[PDB]
Design a protein around this ligand. Structure first.
Ligand code: NAP
Ligand code: NAP
Ligand code: NAP
Ligand code: NAP
Lengths: 323, 323, 323, 323
């Protein structure tokens, strides 16, 4: 495994981060979840990404159990607060109340004294940033959290929060965008801004839910246990955008020669592609298959040639999404 | 139930707040107090107002017991410190000593780790605001209180305290005035000042102790179990001002047609009237009658027409108290 | 009992403070110490003055035991740190180390969660005031102490420490000088400076160890159990200054008519004299005799006429010590 | 024993500090380690120097056990954080994560609530000094550490950290350089800078691993149980520099007359030499021999004549290392 700095900080994360998102009513057995996390550790993954809301507390509980026994110095636990976990209007968002009432349950379920990275899930316009950042100061002073992150935040608001955190001794070191070969919205403004502010990216949908594994053929029936066949949760439509486009699916199939050139699967090429941006500390991978994790983990530290990066842009052409 | 922001904060309160004030020697059975709080929850009330001094600790103890089992994320607990609860000159006021010695008893009696809103009951000229605000900073850092409020405070002193709180990361978000159709002292200066400072009003005597239910006829014997018949405590004289005035009692009776126009009881009209001010986050209701609570709770989110607000002023005329 | 503000603070102290200083090898039985503290409470005394060093922890232990059961809101506990209580050079002074290692033993022996007033005993030139004041900030944040005081401090250094405390949210409200009818060193600079800085005086040797009770006749054998007969500790020489001067002893005897004029014992006149200075919050009294405490306690709130204050100066004349 | 101020602070250290460095696989029995620490206490040593990394936790555990029972006020415990103690890239360095995860193990092994001096072992360029100093602020606020130190740090970075510590109420009072008669690299810049910043030196290799005891003759077989015969760990090469130079070994032998002049062993002269610099608070001594400790301890407070300091420079000549 290769490691990077999360921003201007002393924290190193693995270049490959394991995420274990589950749906509130999910059919994936716990035994399959635990063996995937076990496969991530075997591949040298140190960094784990979860949320209170994932599985409605189940995702954090399973992770807590899988990692019990791993020495604490060897793990970076990233969790999130902001999505609804309680009934009523104080059971969500980034108020002092919701954050204070969230942290202790996250600690219990993960079986730890402190969370390495605590991420504000979504930006919440009701809470002033002075309220939020002082709430984070209190949790850092108490040693319940070490570092702060944000996911899906307007860039003006990232800068503001970084500013206040510098004043209050809150390390704001991490932003979580959607980033892949196909989705490059964050190249325009977010990564340039974040880099100046000492913030690194931990990136999600890096395989666009399997579309960048080359495993979906244009005009075909999708494979046996593929995500296309089992579309649980409101993320299935984000995938439908690409599966209902035989153009993209065919251009993704043409990357395979480029990958084999470099001695990679299409999956490893897509993961290595994200890792080529200096603004990126980590790529998150989803999988409940041990063999997929151990293989996806090997993208860590791979440099792609200037030549191969120019040919990738040519093949994908106008299917790429910018800003 | 409808919810509002308490000031410029992430905290939402219900538009209808339940208060459970008791007298130090009070004849109201506990079973009647517990069933009223139970009726408030059934009506969707999330926000509860009490004080150390109410019932001499009895009011907080009963509330603690009634709300045991309700998830913490679903409640906003507002309590007060400042009124005498101990013997001698340090057993009252807003000194570091009295506040530090008060908070832990409030937490025990309410059965909670933290109080949502901690209100300085009355302004106390002996304590410098620097002493008080640093005492509140220490309680916020420790996570024993989340937000700070004030009740019956000079407006210069609200501004001063808001200023220092912004500097020390103390959210000062709440002021508690007397406010009704008949008592509009806070329109003049308090609500305008508070609105600029990011402070919302949680309002009391919103029915002027039942006078704005239309239930008292000019020149009559007051009903069986009415507050006029059972005048316990030094709040009875504030009511006597209006009951010894057949003029007001007759003008209140003439609102009933205006209420029925809007499909409301006089009580619901009086409560909705307060809620029409943008500076108001919540109206407090007193009652030890389930049927009264469930009915008063339905004023939440009712808009009154411009027409009806002009006709209300005409009927009440010069009985209204301003500044 | 009458009460005063300790400085610009919300803390009230009794005008009569009980001190229980003992010598490291002292013959006074505990039963006599406990009954004196019991007599102080009966006289309405709320404020108690002690030190880690007094009796070598015995003075604090007895006070802790005597006051067990008294409600906490009704007491002001003043203790001191700075005098040697341990072996070696870190077993004394005002270093972070000595103060941090002192506070928990004081709390245990007094049987309390927090000390009302924590006094820096003597000024210590080795420790920078930034180190000391940050150590006091940490103890206030933790709620182990509420207010800070100083005893026998240069006035430049009182001002400096008051300045830093205002910056760090440390209430510096109390100075402890030697002050009596005969010893007026603090009138010159200390009380004027302290009054501008919001600091009140709690005063010691207010009877000059019994010399201002009129109980010592010039050219006589001192009474049976008098302090002159039992000169334990290095405070006996401070008394010898006045007992080896038949002039003063005779001028003190001539105050008795002035006292009887006002319906006071010479002791009550001497105590009331100190309390006439607006810069004074409290006079400390020593006694292990119940009848003396109950009588000395009655000086509280006595105003002396302008006439009587001019005649007192005439009688004592040039025996008075100024600066 | 003689004592000095550690910088501009209230902390006194003994002029002779005992260090107990061990190698991760070391043959020295625990019984020999415990009796050496016992000999240090008997010689009046109050100050003990160790590290998490020394013996891989064994050095701190033995020290913890040897000092159990010694009153806390009588000891200054100096430990270090920064060297690798865990697997992976967060198991080392000065990140919030590594420091937070280190302190509690150091406290447990030493059997104490707080560490007197916490030293950043090596400077770590990955961690910004704002992250580090706020991590130290949190540990001081919590009372887990009292004072902060640095070992082997660039001088620009000492100044920067001292600056931030003054702002955050972190006492930065201590630097640990290599310093002896033969190694004077720190005279050039480090001690002058440190003295202006209120930082004192606790010095190591003060005998250059026994070379300044005069016990190694040029062109000979080194004694029975001498360090030259048993070269464990990567510090043996630093010694080889001097043992492979018959010139130095012969010049060290010629100091013996100068030592006997002053009534000292060559060891006592070398230790007293370091202590002559006003910028030095303490000299660290290594030994697992009781008789060596009790003798080395007697250098404490010895003044050397101007005459003897000029003759020492003449004898050692160009073997001395400067900058
Ligand atoms: N910060 C945020 O707001 C946010 C939002 C969403 C997600 N996330 C995080 O990011 C993660 C994203 O996971 P994701 O699964 O949604 O997106 P993804 O990582 O783009 O997709 C992973 C999926 O692609 C398929 N796949 C991966 N490698 C493969 C291989 N070598 N061969 C064949 N198929 C392969 C697998 O599904 P099948 O084999 O079943 O097709 C796998 O479950 C989540 O776990 C979560 O922790 C964060
Ligand atoms: N911040 C402060 O300093 C402060 C000061 C005072 C009070 N408060 C708070 O505000 C609350 C005010 O309560 P309050 O009772 O004094 O004043 P209120 O809310 O104006 O009066 C409520 C009373 O009016 C009558 N009533 C209400 N709805 C009715 C209906 N639909 N039909 C018939 N009668 C009805 C009831 O008494 P009867 O039926 O018995 O006549 C009821 O107890 C207290 O509980 C307390 O929590 C705060
Ligand atoms: N902050 C500081 O550095 C500091 C320093 C010293 C003391 N103090 C405090 O201040 C206190 C001073 O006590 P102190 O006793 O040294 O000085 P004091 O209060 O001037 O003297 C009290 C003594 O005078 C005699 N006395 C008092 N009232 C009397 C009466 N009505 N009739 C007859 N005799 C009477 C008693 O001794 P006999 O009857 O036995 O003659 C009594 O013990 C101490 O307890 C201590 O807490 C503080
Ligand atoms: N801050 C840092 O980074 C750092 C780095 C290294 C060390 N240190 C500290 O500094 C200490 C340095 O210890 P050190 O032993 O490496 O260097 P040292 O103190 O220069 O050498 C001590 C050694 O010299 C010999 N010796 C001492 N006195 C003697 C006498 N009177 N007669 C004969 N031989 C004598 C002994 O070895 P033999 O008798 O076996 O020859 C003894 O073990 C360590 O314990 C550690 O705590 C700190």
């Amino acid at each position: 495994m290769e490691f990077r700095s999360l921003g201007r900080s002393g924290l190193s994360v693995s270049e490959i981060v394991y995420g274990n998102l589950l749906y509130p009513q999910d059919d994936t057995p716990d035994e399959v979840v635990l063996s995937s996390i076990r496969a991530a550790l075997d591949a040298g993954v140190t960094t784990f990404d979860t949320a209170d809301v994932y599985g409605m507390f189940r995702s954090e509980s399973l992770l807590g159990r899988a990692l019990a026994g791993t020495p604490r110095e060897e793990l970076v636990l990233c969790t999130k607060v902001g999505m609804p976990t309680g009934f009523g209007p104080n059971g969500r968002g980034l108020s002092r109340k919701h954050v204070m009432e969230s942290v202790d349950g996250s600690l219990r379920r993960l079986r730890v004294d402190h969370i390495d990275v605590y991420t504000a899930h979504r930006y919440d316009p009701a809470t002033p940033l002075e309220e939020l950042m002082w709430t984070f100061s209190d949790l850092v002073r108490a040693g319940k959290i070490l570092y702060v992150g944000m996911s899906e935040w307007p860039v003006e608001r990232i800068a503001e929060a970084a500013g206040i955190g510098a004043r209050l001794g809150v390390p704001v070191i991490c932003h979580m965008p959607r980033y892949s070969m196909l989705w490059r919205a964050p190249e325009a403004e977010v990564i340039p801004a974040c880099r100046d502010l000492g913030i690194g990216q931990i990136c999600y949908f890096t395989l666009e839910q399997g579309v960048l594994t080359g495993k979906y053929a244009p005009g075909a029936p999708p494979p046996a246990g593929s995500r296309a066949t089992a579309p649980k949760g409101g993320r299935a439509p984000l995938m439908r955008r690409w599966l209902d486009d035989d153009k993209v699916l065919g251009r993704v199939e043409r990357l395979r020669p480029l990958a084999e050139e470099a001695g990679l699967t299409t999956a490893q090429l897509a993961l290595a592609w994200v890792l080529q941006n200096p603004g990126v500390s980590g790529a998150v991978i989803g999988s409940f298959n041990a063999e997929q994790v151990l293989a996806n983990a090997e993208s860590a530290g791979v440099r792609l040639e200037t030549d191969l990066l120019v040919r990738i842009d040519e093949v994908l052409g106008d299917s790429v999404v910018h800003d």
